[PDB]
Amino acid sequence: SAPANAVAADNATAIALKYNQDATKSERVAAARPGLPPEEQQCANCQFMQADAAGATDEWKGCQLFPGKLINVNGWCASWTLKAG
Numbered sequence: 265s266a267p268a269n270a271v272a273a274d275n276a277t278a279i280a281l282k283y284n285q286d287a288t289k290s291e292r293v294a295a296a297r298p299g300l301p302p303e304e305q306q307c308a309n310c311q312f313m314q315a316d317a318a319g320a321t322d323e324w325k326g327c328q329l330f331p332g333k334l335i336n337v338n339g340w341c342a343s344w345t346l347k348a349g
């Protein structure tokens with residue numbers, strides 16, 4: 265089940281960032297952010313994802329832009345940035 269501090273779709277920051285916990289429902293194709301075909305972009309391959317966040321699970325991870333909350337590994341927002349090694 266989902267953690268109580270999962271980012272909600274109606275959170276003001278979520279709305280400002282165009283976050284969707286399901287990337288397939290997001291505006292990723294239209295946003296065409298660089299580095300990777302948009303249909304492969306998700307929190308899992310984003311520079312801002314923080315896997316060592318409190319409460320992280322296989323599905324729910326931290327994000328630098330959402331302090332104290334958890335995003336969905338399969339989500340996306342308009343700040344998506346390709347993770348560099």
Ligand code: SF4
Nearest residue numbers: 307310312327341344
């Ligand atoms: S910045 Fe990256 S990890 Fe955070 S919600 Fe947006 S796409 Fe997901």
